[PDB]
Structure formats: structure tokens, C-alpha cells
Design a protein around this ligand. Structure first.
Ligand SMILES: O=c1[nH]c2cc(C(F)(F)F)c(N3CCOCC3)cc2n(CP(=O)(O)O)c1=O
Ligand SMILES: CC(C)S(=O)(=O)NC[C@@H](C)c1ccc(-c2ccc(C#N)cc2)cc1
Ligand SMILES: N[C@@H](CCC(=O)O)C(=O)O
Lengths: 257, 259
């Protein structure tokens, strides 16, 4: 049985409202739950979905040097595959493998409606409105490493801001936007931002274009016997239209806003 | 050893400079993929020679002979070390060569003559006054032939049965058809080429609607080549540093003719 690490992040993996009456994989629903089923079918394996123990995507701890989150679960042999909104990055590709992308995204800005910010440059040129990112993910590392003038200015501020502008979970960042009376903006991936913007309480907005352009991939440990097959499966699902079918299903706008 | 790069003359990826007769070797060429090749080579620490694929093809396997043509063939049969071109990452190609993570995103898109009352594939599908079509052979046609989506299947049925033929042999013919048809022909093609042509004089074409699918172009190496890892890491670095975005802007918009 293949151990699949993943993360509770809507609409990728979500606990069903009736999860108590259910066991195993049937406890969960979402884009990545459907994707896991399709990959497993095409690759011919049985699997168990497991939510990442520390609730993190994955970064290499600065002093400790140890990987956390889903990345760490792969690196240290606790899981066989990650099927999640896990961003393909250079530092990760040094220690794990990724399929070609199954979904596009870029870093984006979420504000509470009415916040006088329209761009990353707007954020960088002021301090009245605080802004931050998720801990232990690709967005924070993006800002840490960027030499683009605006993004570097943003990083210089975020790293030293106090109270801390970083959050432990996407939900914490979104809640902070909603409760901060326009004084906190959140930097998060466009396909989470967009999902949230279309749903009640309809009090957030995505502003400006995306800051970058990348993708999520299915990740395996180096030398995994699954790597090649999983990549070909993603490509087949892409060419079959299945990935777009799943995206359109899970991001379907029911017109709540 | 000098790395043999296979590529293709496709604008704005690779083209011969106006003064190419005064120049030699790689200096003869310019474009997005010429710039990309230099950055990849710098990061990987190799010298290289740009060579143009003999048959002018990207790469497909003949059903009868089983022979791979194009740049894919050059890699498969060990004639080139790397392909640096707008080469689409596909299942059948990934089975025989290695690809880097993609350096560019693309999808099927709609080109209209400015003024045409069409904003989407669904708009096209509902009508016949504005004819529409694509290359008579290729991935866009096959997308429509396979599609289970109602709108796209209706478009396929329309295109396959339309008289006169709504298909074209080349993009040059497709674009000329859009420009000469007074708004009565729309052309379906990859977003990247649509965006490029939107920036060419006489500035009378327009990309409309969202892309209908999602794919990527990648750098390819022979399967199991030891160059593959460094190349992939170089692509990831160039992506994260914003260099790929700079290159797209340079060749599509800074050198664009339409504002
Ligand atoms: O790997 C591939 N890369 C391709 C790259 C391009 C370009 F856009 F120019 F970069 C194009 N064009 C489509 C529009 O008309 C001009 C040429 C075709 C490509 N094809 C064949 P397709 O997939 O049948 O279209 C491939 O196979
Ligand atoms: C980390 C980066 C080098 S990357 O993200 O690997 N590639 C850089 C970008 C510009 C890109 C991003 C995404 C897709 C894509 C391809 C296919 C499907 C599907 N289905 C969805 C998205 C293509 C190119
Ligand atoms: N997808 C990101 C998590 C979200 C973010 O960093 O904004 C990752 O893989 O790290």
C-alpha cells in the first residue's frame, strides 16, 4: 500500500461533513482526492491518504537543516508520494522529484474589500497596511530569494515586521485579512485566492496580476519506483482533459458572491 | 566537448539575423530560444553549437515505419545532445526522451480580426456566419476530435463538415485568411503564437477568450542523459529569478509593433 501525504487545503483536500461515519480514503473529498484516485488507477497501486503530521508544505529549517512538511515526509521516507497543491521549486527539486505540472498558479495578493492597494508595488511603498505569507512554503521562499527590486523591498519589510506578518496556515492568513479592518493583506497562490474570492462572506478581493508563473507537481522521493509512471499518468490525464474537468468541478462558481 | 543543440526556425524563438552573412556560428541567430540556450549553457557550464533540425519538424513517430522525425528524432537516434525549442511536453514524447520542467505555458486560443463579435469558443460554437478552423494536421485538430466537452464537440462536428474547408495548411495561411475575410474567419492556434501575431503589423488581429487547454514547452535531452539534471535545475533557477518572464516580454512586447 502506497502512503500518500497530503494537506487539508480547500478545495484540494477537504474532510467530508460526515467523515465520522467513514473510514480511510473515503473520509476526504476534493481535487487532490480525485487526482489521487486517477493516478492510482493509471499506475496500478493501492494507496492510503494521510494528512501531513505538521500541517506544513515543506521547507528546510535554517539552523536544524531538517526538512519539514510534506517534503520532509518524502525526504525521510515517511511517505511514498505527495499529491497536494505542492509547488515545484528549485530547492525542493534538489531533494525530491516532481511530475510535470498538473495545475498552473502564481503568487497573488488578497485584500479585504476597500483596502487601497492594487499591486505589489503599492504594498512595497507603504507600511500602514501590513502584509505577509505562509510559513514553510514556496511563497515565503520566493520573497526570501527574489532580487526583483519590489519583491526584495517587500521581503526586507516582512522578515522584520512586528508583530509577525507570517502565518502557520492558509486559513490563518485569510482570517487575518478578514479581521484586520483593511490593515493586513495576504500573499498567497492564485488558485487559493480565487477559490476564496468566489465564496461567502464575499469580503475579499484578488488585486493585480500574479507575481510569478509556476505549477504544482506530484512529488516522489529520489529513486522512487513510482516517479516515471506518475509523471506519464499526469500527462495522460492532462491530454484526456481530466485535469481541466477536475479543476472546473472543484472551482465551479455557484454565484454566492 | 561542444554540446550539439537542435532547434528550429520558428519566430520569435530562433531566426537568422538580417546580417547573418557577416556572422558565423551561433552569432547568426537571435530570438527567445537563442537567449535561453545561452542562459542554460552558462548555468550548466557547457559550450554549444546551434544546429537547425533538417526536416523542420518538432517530433512524431510514423505509425508504419516507427521512425521518430524532427528534433525528437535527433535526440532519440543520438544525433543531437539537447533540443532547445518550443517543443511541447507530451506523453508519447516523454516515453522516449527526457524533458525539463516547462519554460513556457501555452494553450489553444482564438484569433479574430479586430471587430469580430466573438469573445469565446462558446460564441463560435453557437453560430456559422463566422467560419472557424485550425491547422489541417496537428494537436489542435486532435484536441477537438477527442474532446468530450459539449462546446468543443459541437465545434469539431462543425469544422469537420464545413464546406469550403475551414482548415489551413500553415499559420501563414490561417492568419492571411483571418485578415482577408472581413471578420468572417477565426483561427484556432497556440496562445503563444496568437500573442506574437497580435504584436505584428498591421495590428489587425486579436486574441480572445480563455485558453481551451493547458500545456508547456520544455527542453529535451536523450532519455537518461546526464545533462538532463543540470538543465532542469537551470530552468527552475531561470524561472524563479524572473528571467523567463523577462525573455517573453523582450521578444513579444519590447520588440512588438502594436503597442
Ligand atoms: O512541439 C511542438 N511545438 C510547436 C510549437 C509551435 C509554435 F507555436 F510555433 F511555437 C507550433 N506552431 C503552432 C501555430 O502555427 C505555427 C507553429 C507548433 C508546434 N507543434 C505542432 P502542433 O502541436 O500540431 O501545433 C509541436 O508539436
Ligand atoms: C517551476 C517552473 C519551472 S514550472 O512551473 O515547472 N514551469 C514554468 C511555467 C511558466 C509553466 C507553468 C505551468 C505549466 C502547465 C503545464 C501543464 C498544465 C496542465 N495540465 C498546467 C500548467 C506550463 C509552464
Ligand atoms: N503551494 C505552496 C504553499 C502555499 C504558499 O506558499 O503560498 C507550497 O508548496 O509551498
Amino acid at each position: 500500500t502506497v502512503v500518500v501525504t497530503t494537506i487539508l487545503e480547500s478545495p484540494y483536500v477537504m474532510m467530508k461533513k460526515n467523515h465520522e461515519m467513514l473510514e480511510g480514503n473515503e473520509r476526504y473529498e476534493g481535487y487532490c482526492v480525485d487526482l489521487a484516485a486517477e493516478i492510482a488507477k493509471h499506475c496500478g497501486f493501492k494507496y492510503k491518504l494521510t494528512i501531513v503530521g505538521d500541517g506544513k508544505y515543506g521547507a528546510r529549517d535554517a539552523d536544524t537543516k531538517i526538512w519539514n512538511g510534506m517534503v520532509g515526509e518524502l525526504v525521510y521516507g515517511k511517505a511514498d508520494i505527495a499529491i497536494a497543491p505542492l509547488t515545484i521549486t528549485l530547492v525542493r527539486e534538489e531533494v525530491i522529484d516532481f511530475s510535470k505540472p498538473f495545475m498552473s498558479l502564481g503568487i497573488s495578493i488578497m485584500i479585504k474589500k476597500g483596502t487601497p492597494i492594487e499591486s505589489a508595488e503599492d504594498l512595497s511603498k507603504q507600511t500602514e497596511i501590513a502584509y505577509g505569507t505562509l510559513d514553510s512554503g514556496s511563497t515565503k521562499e520566493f520573497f526570501r530569494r527574489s532580487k526583483i527590486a519590489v519583491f526584495d523591498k517587500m521581503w526586507t519589510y516582512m522578515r522584520s515586521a512586528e508583530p509577525s506578518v507570517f502565518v502557520r496556515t492558509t486559513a490563518e492568513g485569510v482570517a487575518r485579512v478578514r479581521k484586520s479592518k483593511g490593515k493586513y493583506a495576504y500573499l498567497l497562490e492564485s488558485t487559493m485566492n480565487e477559490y476564496i474570492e468566489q465564496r461567502k462572506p464575499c469580503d475579499t478581493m484578488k488585486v493585480g496580476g500574479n507575481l510569478d508563473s509556476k505549477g504544482y507537481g506530484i512529488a516522489t522521493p529520489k529513486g522512487s519506483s513510482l516517479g516515471n509512471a506518475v509523471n506519464l499518468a499526469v500527462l495522460k490525464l492532462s491530454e484526456q482533459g481530466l485535469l481541466d474537468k477536475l479543476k472546473n468541478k472543484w472551482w465551479y462558481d455557484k454565484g454566492e458572491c
